[PDB]
Symmetry: D3
Subunit: 153 residues, 6 copies
């Protein structure tokens, strides 16, 4: 697995409103992943419907989109080895009722419809989501000073 | 599952003695549950024996009661969707040896006889324990400013 | 002077609403003070007017009483050497604008009308406030296991 | 003082490299201030020289600009009553040797030339800096769910 | 079994380099285990080869020894009931990819070759490792003030 | 001021007993100072009397020595620019009553006779204390991966 894999992590409006931006960023920062893009945005309903396009048939789709419009979103790209899969493990189960304490949802969330955060579920979907949410020049190329202490070659 | 389910959480005398009141409250607070009643108490032996009545035949019962009498207890009622079951998940396994890091017992406790907290194990037992430990006027009715960000309802 | 001095600390409705019960308790717990009474309460209007009786001629009085009625209060008695004066130092300046980072108000508060907490300002006023908010039976007598590590003999 | 005052806070490259993005955001989040703009950027030397234009005569100017180019910057706009002045108090003294523990620089920094963060020093300079670093559509208009618990009218 | 079981925990050079000494110590301290020996050391190559002697035929052996020589190590003996097995549970899976958030590796590490810490995997191996890394005079005999609140009599 | 200045910091027996090893190390670690030596020790009375030789005429001397003998001590050497003076600022005032919240004593201590830590008060006394408490080979030479992000040099 390549250490330059990237995933899209978003803090949903309930996470912003409840003051969880700092703690969520710290979870990824402390694990060793590298922040390569971030912005606070209020995207249009059209972008949100495209982001969740595969769930357009679900009964909760309309409420999910409404909720995702109801406040700011903190959109991020994180980079590191197996960051897509491990990022999902850090976030915890989609339904916080199923999540483990020590994960983001297991520490901070209760309802599946207010589960604080989003993370890409595959490398291919992460590439799709990254291009949907960010312009290429918003990804910052840099090298962490502790890279060789986080990674063995 | 209703968002107004309630559970009885108690910090046992070892949790009070070891300075864990703040941290344990923060676990439930940060998860989004609502504190509706709280008091520091030194309850009489008869109340503790009734709390643990279903264990009256166990060999450890007399020692359990004496330990529960040996210091203050922080008695609490927390309210939220599935707070009984999710509260038990936050507490961790009865025997801390079997508990997961990130739970209260998995972070703070070693011995099953010194496992720093109690949580009701079912909705029906929670109602019974709440009534045993609190007068009805000690349960405070209020609405959290972030209720609609914790719950979809 | 004596290590059995007591002060009245209250978390005001804005501190409860903003999820600061755990963090505020931890400030006093970690410092080495002893919690000897605590309850979540929604006190009557006349109790709050008596609490703030020295302020009844101030223009902000009615609004202060009304806001103090607007949500639950976490009422506490803390015990220890110089706990009245040191408790005020932990709380920080009455106006958070004048408070120092590292204090409760310097970490958590902005407006003097929303300064998250209360602490007695003198030993005599502490005794008055403890007698107003607590029945004597609610003060719990116990000895901390680390008393002789917090205090010299 | 108006509660809609805004200031420019930046995490400098040393703060990003040392993994302080989460903790710094939390300092402002926990105090009650509202995040209304944020982005990770690598601005050109021309923008940085304009940002520090008033220090172009200083002997450390060239080294300061080089250092500000040497890694990513987390640029933010925070909003609240007296946020410019109180933001500076949260950051601590420019020279961390003079800073108090409990501030950002007093907790995390040693050298004036590596002092982790920037904050505007006046309302007028904040307006200048905000327009230098952000496009107007990057400022997100929203209303915190706890606004009325942070502010008294 | 007995509350005087001992294990050897070491913070590897990557944990020291990334500023994780405090957090790792706190994990064991907060759980109730007793620190009975500790030192910062840069041990000789033959001590590390003996530490990992069971792995001398693995292909990664020489690189593991070389990285373990590449910075200081914080070497510790922790004492308590089942501290060997529970210590491994606190550390988390050897490969951080398989570790759970809430453990040391699940909170802080990514690569199996950079997994920030070591813990003995059996009581017999703990005794071997303690005798290899510590002179008996470096194990300090003391009684925790909260022993009887961590352990049942 | 040279970045290779060193100071002697010790966690006194009360800090060890009260579970403050992790937190105190994190204060210095997070500030950017370099740990160059550490050991848990129970030093002989003669060493403690020599450490405090300038207080041999004080009325509290015999009690101070007995308390310093009453449990383990965590002895440390920290290195960095102005670490002697800045270390004292992090520790807070000798008498915790006069200390500021956010310092070690202002967060964790009450009594001057139980003030949880020691720090050298001058560069010359630090060299004397370092030599008293450590053998030269116990001081580990290493270079922090973030050295150039903490210091401008
Ligand atoms: N109300 C409701 N919302 C859901 C449900 N399932 C998913 N969602 C929301 O839709 C988002 C996307 O769903 P999905 O892609 O399947 O899960 P995810 O990849 O873990 O976020 C989730 O994060 C939830 O916020 C559901 O059964 N009910
Ligand atoms: N000494 C001892 N105490 C026990 C044992 N099992 C349970 N306890 C204590 O009894 C309490 C109540 O037991 P139980 O209701 O079955 O578990 P809980 O609902 O998870 O607290 C536990 O929290 C322990 O404090 C045991 O085997 N030995
Ligand atoms: N709106 C407003 N409220 C105030 C003012 N001064 C005090 N208060 C409130 O009144 C409470 C009691 O005032 P005081 O006893 O002087 O301050 P305290 O003992 O430090 O809390 C304070 O904690 C504030 O909540 C003011 O000038 N304006
Ligand atoms: N090397 C060095 N850098 C400095 C000095 N003074 C200021 N700086 C840097 O220049 C930045 C801007 O300086 P200034 O506007 O006066 O202070 P600030 O508004 O508190 O950031 C500071 O944040 C420091 O990073 C100095 O005397 N030496
Ligand atoms: N590069 C690499 N290093 C490994 C591998 N397996 C183990 N290690 C390292 O060797 C150490 C000892 O291995 P082991 O005793 O099996 O794991 P541990 O007891 O859980 O630490 C581990 O902690 C890793 O640092 C591997 O497959 N590849
Ligand atoms: N009981 C008592 N102990 C004291 C007093 N003054 C100092 N001490 C203890 O003596 C230690 C050394 O005193 P000193 O060197 O003057 O202060 P320090 O350098 O800040 O530790 C202090 O840290 C206290 O633990 C006092 O007046 N009474
Ligand atoms: Mg999906
Ligand atoms: Mg039961
Ligand atoms: Mg007052
Ligand atoms: Mg300037
Ligand atoms: Mg092993
Ligand atoms: Mg001295």
């Amino acid at each position: 697995s390549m250490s330059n894999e990237q995933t899209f992590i978003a803090i949903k409006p309930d996470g912003v409103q409840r003051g969880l931006i700092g703690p969520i960023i710290s979870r990824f920062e402390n694990r060793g992943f590298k922040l390569v893009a971030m912005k606070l945005v209020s995207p249009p309903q059209s972008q949100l419907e495209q982001h969740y396009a595969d769930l357009s048939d679900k009964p909760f789709f309309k409420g999910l989109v409404s909720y995702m419009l109801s406040g700011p979103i903190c959109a991020m790209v994180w980079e590191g080895r197996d960051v897509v899969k491990t990022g999902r493990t850090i976030l915890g189960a989609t339904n916080p009722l199923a999540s483990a304490p020590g994960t983001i949802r297991g520490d901070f969330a209760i309802d599946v419809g207010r589960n604080v955060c989003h993370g890409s579920d595959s490398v291919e979907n992460a590439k799709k989501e990254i291009a949907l949410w960010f312009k290429p020049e918003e990804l910052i190329s840099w090298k962490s000073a502790t890279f060789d202490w986080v990674y063995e070659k």
